[PDB]
Amino acid sequence: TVYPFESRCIGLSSGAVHYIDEGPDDGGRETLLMLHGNPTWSFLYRHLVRDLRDEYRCVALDYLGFGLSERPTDFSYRPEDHADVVEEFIDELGLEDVVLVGHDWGGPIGFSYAIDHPENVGGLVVMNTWMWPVSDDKHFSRFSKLLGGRIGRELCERYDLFTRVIMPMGFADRSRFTESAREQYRAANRGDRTGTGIFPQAILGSRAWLSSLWEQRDNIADIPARIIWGMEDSAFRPAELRTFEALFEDSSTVRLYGVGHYVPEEFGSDLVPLVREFLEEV
Amino acid sequence: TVYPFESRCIGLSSGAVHYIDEGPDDGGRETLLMLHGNPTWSFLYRHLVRDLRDEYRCVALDYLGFGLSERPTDFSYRPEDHADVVEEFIDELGLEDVVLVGHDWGGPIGFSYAIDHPENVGGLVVMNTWMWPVSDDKHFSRFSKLLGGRIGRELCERYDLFTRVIMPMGFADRSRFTESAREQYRAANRGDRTGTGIFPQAILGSRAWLSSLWEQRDNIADIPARIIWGMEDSAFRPAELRTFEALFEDSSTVRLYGVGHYVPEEFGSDLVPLVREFLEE
Numbered sequence: 001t002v003y004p005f006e007s008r009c010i011g012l013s014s015g016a017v018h019y020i021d022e023g024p025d026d027g028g029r030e031t032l033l034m035l036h037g038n039p040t041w042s043f044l045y046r047h048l049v050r051d052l053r054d055e056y057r058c059v060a061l062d063y064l065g066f067g068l069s070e071r072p073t074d075f076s077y078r079p080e081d082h083a084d085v086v087e088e089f090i091d092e093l094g095l096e097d098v099v100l101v102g103h104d105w106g107g108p109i110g111f112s113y114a115i116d117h118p119e120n121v122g123g124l125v126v127m128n129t130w131m132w133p134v135s136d137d138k139h140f141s142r143f144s145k146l147l148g149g150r151i152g153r154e155l156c157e158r159y160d161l162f163t164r165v166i167m168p169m170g171f172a173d174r175s176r177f178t179e180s181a182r183e184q185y186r187a188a189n190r191g192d193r194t195g196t197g198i199f200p201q202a203i204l205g206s207r208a209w210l211s212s213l214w215e216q217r218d219n220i221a222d223i224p225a226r227i228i229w230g231m232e233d234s235a236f237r238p239a240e241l242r243t244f245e246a247l248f249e250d251s252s253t254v255r256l257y258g259v260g261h262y263v264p265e266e267f268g269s270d271l272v273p274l275v276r277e278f279l280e281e282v
Numbered sequence: 283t284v285y286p287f288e289s290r291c292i293g294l295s296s297g298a299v300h301y302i303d304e305g306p307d308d309g310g311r312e313t314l315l316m317l318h319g320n321p322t323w324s325f326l327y328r329h330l331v332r333d334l335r336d337e338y339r340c341v342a343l344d345y346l347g348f349g350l351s352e353r354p355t356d357f358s359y360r361p362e363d364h365a366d367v368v369e370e371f372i373d374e375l376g377l378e379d380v381v382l383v384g385h386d387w388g389g390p391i392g393f394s395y396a397i398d399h400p401e402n403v404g405g406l407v408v409m410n411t412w413m414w415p416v417s418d419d420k421h422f423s424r425f426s427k428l429l430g431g432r433i434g435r436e437l438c439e440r441y442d443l444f445t446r447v448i449m450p451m452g453f454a455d456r457s458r459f460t461e462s463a464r465e466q467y468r469a470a471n472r473g474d475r476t477g478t479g480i481f482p483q484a485i486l487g488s489r490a491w492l493s494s495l496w497e498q499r500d501n502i503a504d505i506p507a508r509i510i511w512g513m514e515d516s517a518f519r520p521a522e523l524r525t526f527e528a529l530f531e532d533s534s535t536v537r538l539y540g541v542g543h544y545v546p547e548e549f550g551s552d553l554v555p556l557v558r559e560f561l562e563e
Contacts, residue, residue: 134519136519214528239414245529249500
């Protein structure tokens with residue numbers, strides 16, 4: 001009722017993935033690929049997909065271990081493996097020219113794709129992301145340590161902490177977190193919670209990867225971009241917003257008010273125009 | 283005994299300033315200008331000046347309302363006015379080609395000089411600075427609100443909070459905060475404490491200025507630079523360190539261990555080589 005969109009599935013060498021694919025299959029137009037955050041599903045972008053659909057092909061991907069995708073028992077939830085999932089997916093769908101849209105963890109993954117394959121990137125839109133090692137922001141660091149490590153995994157697997165508490169925590173307005181959205185995020189089972197439990201640990205251990213991506217920003221600078229930041233966000237500070245603008249040449253920042261971490265769900269109605277303007281301009 | 287360096291004074295249109303000026307007066311060599319943080323004096327860089335002196339002319343400036351400088355009763359402690367103090371000072375001393383070194387508040391001020399007059403800047407070294415509006419770092423924001431506003435001013439003027447507590451708070455190793463350093467910082471009088479009390483408020487209200495400087499970074503990018511960051515700092519996060527490196531073309535970051543906010547005092551012995559290498563390269 002809420003998610004009427006056509007759903008499809010790709011078998012990848014590391015496991016099958018679910019995706020949403022709206023708009024024409026006649027790919028004479030640019031494709032936009034959406035990458036979700038944690039513990040979210042591609043459903044996070046239901047509104048964004050709905051409206052962008054009539055102008056651009058819109059594809060949204062569920063990461064392995066999340067959403068409606070396969071969860072190999074040996075999958076390592078390193079950003080490197082998530083990047084490989086995205087890369088193979090883009091090739092499997094024939095998506096030769098793609099604008100990437102990423103949120104939270106999806107930021108660094110879309111960014112990484114663009115670093116490795118800038119040739120196939122038609123532009124980048126990032127929102128409330130985890131790009132760059134986070135060393136100074138004590139809010140995140142304290143949560144990362146609690147939600148990471150052994151205790152992290154146990155908290156996620158035993159209590160679904162990451163969905164029952166942390167998800168609402170990231171909303172400036174929890175009345176927009178509809179029961180259906182809450183159900184689908186909580187629909188993930190106990191085994192799926194392992195991938196979620198690992199995520200913040202992956203950030204703590206992926207600092208070398210994030211640092212490498214930062215160093216390669218001078219090359220990603222040739223790809224047009226937009227950075228969306230909520231005024232009440234927890235994953236990104238205005239200091240970072242300004243620093244990223246200073247480095248990522250040919251980019252622009254957007255500040256959204258009355259919005260937290262989960263921007264596309266609370267303010268999808270503003271995100272749509274921001275993305276459409278980007279897609280129209282370049 | 284601790285600060286043997288020759289001291290001089292310039293009358294500026296906004297008040298007189300004190301400065302340290304070491305090395306030859308025969309300016310056939312590059313000059314390095316050091317800008318202090320808060321509530322510090324140019325004494326912060328005594329070690330850095332001592333060693334750089336024999337290779338480069340070293341000048342260190344006390345900001346109006348701080349150190350051994352004049353405190354006009356109408357001085358506005360906006361970064362804009364501090365930048366004008368630095369600009370006029372550089373012109374008054376004939377310092378035609380200057381490498382700027384800034385810490386804390388001195389960061390944005392040296393940076394601003396470079397934005398307005400990149401032509402006179404031989405390079406930039408910044409350490410634990412307040413560049414860019416700070417919106418996400420709740421540690422600073424909570425202190426800014428406490429140390430800023432009316433209560434901020436009262437806390438500084440009545441209790442010298444900013445020197446008795448905040449200064450030691452910024453050290454990873456307080457045993458390096460010698461009694462002489464402690465005395466000189468605390469030597470500032472109650473009226474001088476007003477300038478100090480305003481500082482964090484100036485940051486909260488100067489966000490437009492800091493934002494403008496950030497936007498002009500694409501032009502400052504033509505000036506070689508180094509960014510020094512303490513692993514236990516409170517004014518700057520590694521996220522920012524990485525972002526600044528990404529934007530400031532022709533720059534490099536340095537991470538110092540076992541050091542807090544007041545880097546040149548705790549680890550002056552590492553800062554000297556970092557600055558000398560920059561100046562040699």
